[PDB]
Design a protein around this ligand. Structure first.
Ligand SMILES: [Cl-]
Ligand SMILES: [Mn+2]
Length: 470
């Protein structure tokens, strides 16, 4: 349960600081995350600052590192805005950006350190929010923009795209101030909430690929198998080449019933059945069959641009650049194909490569899975049943920039959190011991360690997670 008014008062404090620099003509340096949550965040800032006539400079980065900060200190700008990142780097921002004004618009459990007067943290977790459900980075940026100018409520759909990219409706419904963003979008008529199949491909994919791509949750015997997905849809009376948006509201409901009956007949869990059908946000600002028409397809489009280090192109897509959109549309297929190959590699190599401790699975894929896909891989390992879901899963891959550097993503489930696991806290502690950087949510976190400390990290993280069990 959040204190929404107290959080908004915090937003106004950050707004008054930015207006100080806007009125002096200071260029706003913007650092945002590479995923859809960060790309939408930067687009919201770009539009909001544009409405105020302010100048800005956006960089789309993978994480807030000490090396990135060492460069940001000798740049030139007077004010820096970190959006969809920075909550886990407060002491490093404090150490390096001590001479400059900093605003952090993020939703991760913040590093428990004090801040300087000109560094304002805008984070809903400090006001009682659940970090993965109640608001995302684009949502914090949205309320920042809305307080700056109420006309920025027309960015409510873009903000929701980021929340869907961050899977804040993973249980099937929206929570927290995401519902307040949705209301703003509804009053402007720029978004609409449906109760539909919560899978990728509503707009641009045939039904059989929508079913075969389903990994969160998986559809038994159908996930990863387009041929069986075709057979199942035909026997239930559906054209497998039809797109979900082409179905009538009647055929949709009958599809849902068949899928729910199918889940039950194959022993799927209650929680997976309940989240298969849920809130789906669409936008009448875009035509049907366009990936921008639906939030998950929009978010997947933006993640595809980030995958090829073209996140600035995804920002332009959010701002309406149709040329950027035509380029971005050609990146989605290879993005979804790499996820399919990742899942096949997981099924083949999990048993022979995973390191299973008393409290964690640690899988090192080398470079068989892209460093920006280890989060999906860890989630896929759980949803496919490879891993005991009450034991957290960490997937490591060599980073694209440094072969001696590893990128790891940790994922777990709700009932593991009930046992006391907190991945963000555990990874943060282990990071300080192996000269790395880590942190994140209790259910989902990331860490970067040098490759040489991998075997030591596995022992260390298993011990740290074991100490949390209570
Ligand atoms: Cl991560
Ligand atoms: Mn985020």
């Amino acid at each position: 349960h959040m204190d929404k008014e107290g959080f908004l008062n915090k937003v106004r404090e950050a707004v008054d600081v930015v207006k100080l620099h806007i009125e002096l003509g200071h260029t706003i340096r913007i650092i945002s995350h590479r995923d859809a949550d960060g790309i939408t965040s930067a687009a919201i800032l770009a539009k909001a600052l544009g409405r105020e006539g302010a100048s800005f400079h956006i960089s789309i980065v993978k994480q807030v590192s000490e090396d990135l900060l060492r460069e940001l200190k000798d740049e030139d700008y007077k004010i820096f805005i970190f959006s969809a990142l920075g909550s886990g780097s407060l002491s490093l921002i404090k150490e390096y950006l001590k001479e400059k004004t900093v605003i952090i618009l993020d939703h991760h459990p913040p590093e428990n350190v004090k801040l300087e007067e000109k560094h304002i943290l805008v984070n809903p977790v400090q006001f009682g929010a659940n970090s993965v459900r109640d608001l995302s980075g684009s949502g914090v940026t949205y309320f920042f923009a809305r307080e700056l100018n109420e006309k920025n409520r027309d960015l409510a759909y873009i903000a929701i795209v980021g929340a869907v990219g961050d899977m804040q409706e993973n249980d099937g419904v929206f929570h927290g101030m995401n519902l307040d963003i949705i209301e703003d979008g509804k009053s402007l008529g720029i978004l609409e909430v449906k109760k539909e199949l919560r899978l990728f491909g509503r707009e641009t994919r045939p039904l059989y690929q929508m079913l075969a791509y389903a990994t969160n949750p998986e559809i038994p015997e159908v996930t990863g198998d387009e041929r069986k997905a075709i057979e199942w849809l035909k026997n239930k009376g559906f054209n497998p080449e039809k797109k979900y948006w082409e179905l009538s509201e009647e055929e949709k409901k009958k599809l849902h019933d068949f899928l729910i009956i199918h889940m039950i007949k194959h022993g799927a869990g209650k929680e997976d059945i309940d989240r298969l059908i849920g809130d789906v946000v669409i936008s009448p600002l875009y035509p049907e069959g366009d990936p921008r028409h639906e939030a998950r397809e929009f978010a997947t489009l933006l993640n595809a641009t980030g995958r090829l280090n073209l996140g600035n192109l995804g920002v332009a897509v959010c701002l309406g650049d149709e040329e950027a959109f035509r380029k971005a549309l050609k990146m989605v297929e290879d993005y979804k194909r790499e996820q399919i190959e990742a899942r096949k590699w997981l099924l083949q190599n999990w048993n022979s490569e995973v390191w299973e401790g008393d409290h964690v699975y640690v899988l090192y894929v080398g470079k068989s899975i892209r460093d920006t896909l280890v989060g999906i891989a860890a989630s896929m390992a759980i949803n496919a049943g490879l891993a005991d879901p009450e034991k957290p899963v960490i997937v490591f891959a060599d980073t694209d920039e440094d072969p001696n550097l590893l990128k790891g993503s940790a994922r777990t489930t709700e009932r593991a959190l009930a046992k006391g696991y907190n991945l963000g806290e555990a990874l943060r502690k282990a990071a300080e011991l192996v000269n790395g950087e880590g942190g994140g949510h209790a259910i989902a976190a990331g860490i970067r360690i040098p490759r040489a400390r991998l075997a030591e990290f596995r022992k260390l993280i298993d011990k740290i997670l074991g100490e949390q069990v209570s």
